[model samples]
Target: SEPTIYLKETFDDGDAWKERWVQSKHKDDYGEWQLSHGKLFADENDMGLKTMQDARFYSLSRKFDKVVDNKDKPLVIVYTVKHEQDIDCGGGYIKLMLENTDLEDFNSDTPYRIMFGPDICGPEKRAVHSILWHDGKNYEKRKNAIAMADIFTHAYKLIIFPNNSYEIWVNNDKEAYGRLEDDWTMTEPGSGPVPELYRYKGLGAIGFELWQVKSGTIFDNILITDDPEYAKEFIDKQLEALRPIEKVESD
Candidate 1:
């Protein structure tokens, strides 16, 4: 069987990234995103986009062709995050808007089709979160608190099946899994101006819109695809490459 890859970004080419990614100017002084290999890495060439300012909002979007059909194929999103600053309080979540959206005006308030990742604050107030933007309302569900400020890069894999069920994986471990109908009150995106007939034309943007208490959070190896196997192998490769660096650094 063949797999359909919707969007894949490794941040391989930092110099030409500006042409592909758009930085938001919603505020006078928002956190600027920087491309680097972080304090630890498998290869100096394997760079990630990092947050560069403390207590400031971070917003950046990259456009992807809108051809993801949730009804026809399983949707999977995978990305890696490195918390180099021992972040005390902040968001590490990724917001995805798979609808018509402007990249230049991307901000914290922009509606998202799905939000996946972690949010951490100190030791007691940390947890993994997933949100579904259905019918103009956000329905959220949370799993048990996970790691943060561990000084190691953690990989997150989210697999949403066409059946409206999903699984969340962190560092190759299954952290959470549930059905959208059972987890939230939102009723399967029943109402929206965008009709299902003209669905494939919705060219929305995916962005790393996070708010952090401290800086030095690196995000990379972002992937969006329709095959579970492909996403698994993609994440596995990242973990395989980055494991050595992590083992040497974790004290």
Candidate 2:
């Protein structure tokens, strides 16, 4: 069957999506997420967004009008991340929140099915392609995940299969992958099978987060679908189209 597209964000309409994306209303002058024009890697118009403010918190979430159910099929998420600033400390990732999320009160504490993207800090806090899963209450991060660096635009793809297995790709290439049931420490160190109901059933909301970033971290082409191959194909075409523009910039 052809993959079903659950949610896609090109940010072309700009403020037209304001109602869909709810921003954190913290008292401090943290920052807000807003759409801009053009991309960091390519000169693509309507492809950039500002993280807003420095040394402050910024949370933006948009609940999907349609649920991405992977119970019977695979689910794939593809997005692009760019760190145009020095990026000494910040989170350049998005969360796939569970169905029980309250959009009005959504924050870091909000339960999520998966959290995937880049997280870079000072000398000791350099982690790329970080992947985490929710185990009922807390989130368990994947150990020995792939590492990424530099300030260019990067393509990230995550595939979650119905068999509890998963795969991750960077720049249209395979980076790291494993089983969702095995990667997360759901139970005690020496525990038995965790409850089947605890696994990720359906994705309810999708949110973009940035906390205490020194500068801006841009995101674009956020997509979600049920077909892994189709998602890969779409991203490959996008990367190929950008190649010509990239070469023009290089020369």
Candidate 3:
């Protein structure tokens, strides 16, 4: 297994949040603040969300302090978007950003020239299980998962990068996809899209997300890896890392 970073956002009784690492609406003044109004769940010391809007708003907004511009590589984001049956924000989306002020970019589309949504279908219609983006004209939908909607409301490993290389893997147990589940893995920003607004467009900085317009969704085990292969490796390492603790020991 390879090194992995856990990313999540938790909500308690009210609208409060608990995450391993997060950037809320006030992380930076004038900087875009991520917000959500969905149900949040907290367990003793762990936090969990029950809505995609509640989870996405933070999943994509988490950031790192690395610079990646002009290095055009690839990025991988792997996690579980649970209970996606009712998503107001679809499968949620990721915005490639470059910003100066926070609130200023709320309505600006310049920084998010490139982005992807896991699913986007009207509540009244069947969910469109594909990734999509804007083309400066109309919303363009990719037909990758359209034919295989069975895995629509499940956890998946989503990968993206330069040179038009992208892949979304369903858990192994998935009857159709054949149960690809093991551990969520991801790559650095180079493996994904980079917004032009930030100076280090290509490097890993912050992950931002738009709170889903809907509710009753949950996301977990979020990770950003530079290599999908490495992420898989790390998943195995995690299992190994947990083995020692499982042994019965009375000290």
Candidate 4:
């Protein structure tokens, strides 16, 4: 099938992209930070009292008003988050989530998602691929939950298949496990860091969230493509996408 990559912003240009998203201020240290741009968390929004120390950590959101149909939009969003771990004390990662504003109230049951991340906020977790879906009512424990890990990045592809089945991927690798209330990974209700995916609420929009761990991270080549044939094909395609980033070398 012919792929249709709607839009791509490398942040190489300027702050035009970040402006589209609703940010309180714009810092110059990042040099015209835009949709694909990078900046120190403190500089980007001044949220972190942390020092710059020449690190890039910031979050931004985008809304595809023109191309998105909203009602019946069957699109798959994907992106590569190049995490530059600062050896000092800087330790954090990015999480991808969706927002559907047209819906009624986006509360606990109405979950903001964290498609992929290094599990910084939670008590027990690691780099993983999963979904934190909210039903707009109440949480089984944390309002949202996850099960799939080990395959979040390469396949952060959200596949809203028929029969109410929503599947996610990481580099085409099947999710090894999920985290829920019963599991040791999650906390009780109304506690712990609620999935911030809900922070960017609206209709059919996703947010690239930065937790501001330590130094810097870069998100490149955002895509919304179709599904991969199988696991092998998925990993192969993911490798093709990121030739420079040192991947987990395995057979």
Candidate 5:
């Protein structure tokens, strides 16, 4: 089957991003997003959207050309988030919302089919968060997958297969993966021979609603597709490009 590209954003062009992305006005005191390489990068020109202020939440999103129905095909999401600051309490996550989600009023209240990324605080609270909305219900993953702690950019990849299985990766390494039903308690016992699992239909937009105590997290190289091969290839190219060519002599 031919893979379909739903949303692919590199934030490559300057100033033009404003036209594509809708800055959520849900709150007047939201944090600002600016394009930058965040003090370290393989290429200076390869920039991302960085949080410009601390202690403030951020909301930015854009709609796809049409609704993405990942009922029977693999749904792949890939992106990179770099913590340029000494992050204490913050989230580097992205939300995939339903079709009718209003970009003008994008907020935590928005209904998202899935929310995936790294959320950090104390060691007790730090983990790769993966939330899925199944059959009008919200379910959070039961895994304690630790997020990578570093100043360098880390590419995150999520692939949801047609068999209701999923895999989460960071920097081209698979960290956590399993059947979605087993990880998240979404249904009851004996509901059916096979109770329908997470099938994302009418998936509209991808958004960033971050709340950081200390900002300076750069998000970039975002892509959405229905092919695992393409996703893995893209992640490799992204991680390599974001890293320095020469090995550092010291940390």
Candidate 6:
């Protein structure tokens, strides 16, 4: 079956892509989003955007004009992130927000459906594929996950199947897999099964966020689709395209 692409962002060009993204910035913030090119393992010629300062909180949101109902279909989100600096603390993940997210004032308090990616803090608190789920009132983040490599570019892919089972892969390797209901703290401790209504749905917007970091995090080639095979093909195609550049980086 042909894949249904809900959103696609490949910031290979100018600032035109900014139209779809809303950012939170202040006067004293140290870093801002900027584009780069000629990077070692960039998928395309240009790497989309990266945090370029220190001691700042950066958040950006992009709402999909079209709503993707993932009730019965697989939803896949794939992107690339690179932590190529002396990273101390920062979140290099994408948050899948609820239906009515206000992109203008997006922040930590904003409601999100799923938050997945690498969140590193010093040496001991490295979150390789940290996955979080919002339980209406609070966000429950998984604790025991593999650690991700720093100073190298890696492709991150997340697949949410219809059965509430999810899988996360880093650089095309299976890293983690589990059902959503079992992995997250859905209800109060000792609470019973989660209600059907409480199941995750209504995925609308995507946000890129960085917090309290002295290093940098880069992201590029964002895509959301409903087909797992297509997602694999898409990721494989990107790896093939980047092979030449990867060889150069290895040299």
Q: Judged by lDDT, which candidate is best?
A: 5
Q: Name the better of 2 and 5 by lDDT.
A: 5
The models' CA-based lDDT, in order, is 0.75, 0.68, 0.38, 0.37, 0.82, 0.71
Query: Which of the two, 3 or 6, has more TM-score?
Result: 6
The list of candidate 1 runs beyond 4 A from truth reads 142-149, 187-203
TM-score of each: 0.89, 0.85, 0.48, 0.49, 0.93, 0.85
TM-score winner between 2 and 4, please give it. Answer: 2
The collision pairs in model 5 are none
lDDT of 2 by residue, 23-57 (tens): 76633464766665434344445466677678877
Q: Look at candidate 6 and tell me the lDDT of residue 162.
A: 71
Winning model by TM-score: 5
After TM-score superposition, what is the CA distance of residue 90 in candidate 6 from its true location, in Å?
A: 1.6
Worst 10 residues of 3 by lDDT: 178-187
What TM-score number comes out for model 5? 0.93
Ranking by TM-score: 5, 1, 6, 2, 4, 3
For model 2, name the residue pairs that clash.
none
Worst 10 residues of 2 by lDDT: 191-200
Candidate 4 accuracy as lDDT: 0.37
Off by over 4 Å in 3: 1-46, 50-60, 69-73, 84-91, 99-110, 120-141, 147-153, 161-164, 172-214, 233-251
Whichever of 3 and 4 has more lDDT, that candidate is 3
Residue-level lDDT for 157 in candidate 4 = 45
Cα lDDT tens digits for candidate 4, 151-178:
1123234444322234445554444323
